[PDB]
Amino acid sequence: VKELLEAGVHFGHERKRWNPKFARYIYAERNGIHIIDLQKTMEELERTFRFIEDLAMRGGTILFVGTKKQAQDIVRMEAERAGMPYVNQRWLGGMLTNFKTISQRVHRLEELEALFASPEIEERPKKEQVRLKHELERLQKYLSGFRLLKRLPDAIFVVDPTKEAIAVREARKLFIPVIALADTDSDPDLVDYIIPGNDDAIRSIQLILSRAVDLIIQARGGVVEPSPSYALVQ
RNA sequence: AGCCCUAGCACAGGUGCUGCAUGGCCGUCGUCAGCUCGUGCCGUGAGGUGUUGGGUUAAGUCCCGCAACGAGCGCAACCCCCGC
């Protein structure tokens, strides 16, 4: 069930803010805007999903990254609808790269789940009370989907590679293959498996992402509903 | 044997010089909000980033941001005096 779904309103997006590297994956410039060829979207989408399968079934790990308004919450869903880690709030420099050291923050996060419910729940010099228990805040805020990552991922799934270029560059440095939902800002050449689509339309992001998580579960049996994600659409 | 007295021998002694050979301890900028490290990222490189920025503080005090994430010597606190 694809075909026209994307053609809902999730074809073409950005306008003359382009990157001529994307000249291939475009149909026409109607009414001032760029409109992306969907035949080609599919051509790529298969190969891309086919990648997902082959490493999904092998029991891989995809690191999901979306931070635009229009993604964000739709990432902490489908990622968690998959047990797959995600970055949602802000991409920290060296997440893949300085990983060992960024991890030390998770090493130190879950020292607080301990003292969440412990003899240290309503005691200790109680200015420390809030500050320690408001330190977990920064921690829970940024490392929500990141705590699961215990080893470097086998892939990264991105929704805007020119927004998330800092992550991508980290990937490729580590040869971690880059998967991305990407439109006419983004430089294809450094996106390994490409889903030429729409970095912005909240509909588009979901239509694609959710369905890609579907294969991640289909490759381990037990698919469900249209999935807990239909946004505050209006 | 110990120890004392005279003639000898090693050695004692020196507030004699060198703070520009030094230890130690002090003074000083200055109780000023600073000075750095680890890993990553940038740069052929010295280096940079971090520590720049906005709000806030007695304070690099916190906050919000951010290719950085943290850490040490600082600041503050743990000590003493005075107030109930």
Q: Is the CB of A100 under 7 A from strand B?
A: yes
Q: Is the CB of A106 under 7 A from strand B?
A: no
Elucidation method: X-ray
CATH label of the domain that carries residue A18: 3.40.50.10490
Q: Name the closest nucleotide to A99, judged by C1' and CA.
A: B40
Residue A40 CA, nucleotide B14 C1', distance (Å)? 102
Residue A134 CA, nucleotide B77 C1', distance (Å)? 20
Cα-only R_g, chain A:
19
Q: Which nucleotides of B are covered by protein (CB under 7 A)?
A: 38-42, 64, 66-70
Residues in chain A: 234
Mark whether A159 and A59 lie in a shared domain.
yes
Q: Is the CB of A97 under 7 A from strand B?
A: yes
Widest distance between CA atoms in chain A: 66
Residues near A151 by Cβ (< 8 Å), separated by ≥ 6? Answer: A61
Mark whether A143 and A154 lie in a shared domain.
no
Residue A217 CA, nucleotide B11 C1', distance (Å)? 97
Q: Name the closest nucleotide to A94, judged by C1' and CA.
A: B40
Q: Name the closest nucleotide to A141, judged by C1' and CA.
A: B64
Q: Please spell the DSSP secondary structure of A177-214, one letter per residue.
A: -EEEEE-TTS-GGG-SEEEES-SS-HHHHHHHHHHHHH
CATH label of the domain that carries residue A134: 1.10.287.610
Cα gap A229→A12, rounded to integer Å: 23
Q: Is the CB of A138 under 7 A from strand B?
A: yes
Q: Please spell the DSSP secondary structure of A75-138, one letter per residue.
A: HHHHTGGGT--EE-S---TTTTTSHHHHHHHHHHHTHHHHHHTSSSSS-SSTHHHHHHHHHHHH
Resolution in Å, one decimal place: 3.4
Strand-pair partners of A155: A62
Residue A213 has phi, psi (to 5 degrees) of -75, -30
Mark whether A84 and A171 lie in a shared domain.
yes
Among the listed residues A91, A100, A72, A101, the one whose alpha carbon sits nearest the alpha carbon of residue A165? A91
Mark whether A46 and A16 lie in a shared domain.
yes
Mark whether A234 and A156 lie in a shared domain.
yes
The residue segments making up the domain with residue A196 are 4-91+148-234
- Tell me how many domains chain A contains: 2
Q: Answer yes or no: are the C-beta atoms of A50 and A212 closer than 8 Å.
A: no
Mark whether A110 and A212 lie in a shared domain.
no
Cα gap A136→A132, rounded to integer Å: 7
Q: Is the CB of A130 under 7 A from strand B?
A: no
Q: Is the CB of A152 under 7 A from strand B?
A: no
Q: Name the closest nucleotide to A134, judged by C1' and CA.
A: B63
Mark whether A74 and A139 lie in a shared domain.
no
Residue in the structure block whose two tokens are 């470097």: A152
Domain boundary among A110, A131, A147: A147
CA terminus-to-terminus distance, chain A: 24
Among the listed residues A79, A82, A7, the one whose alpha carbon sits nearest the alpha carbon of residue A42? A7
Q: Is the CB of A173 under 7 A from strand B?
A: yes
Report helix, strand or coil for A30.
strand
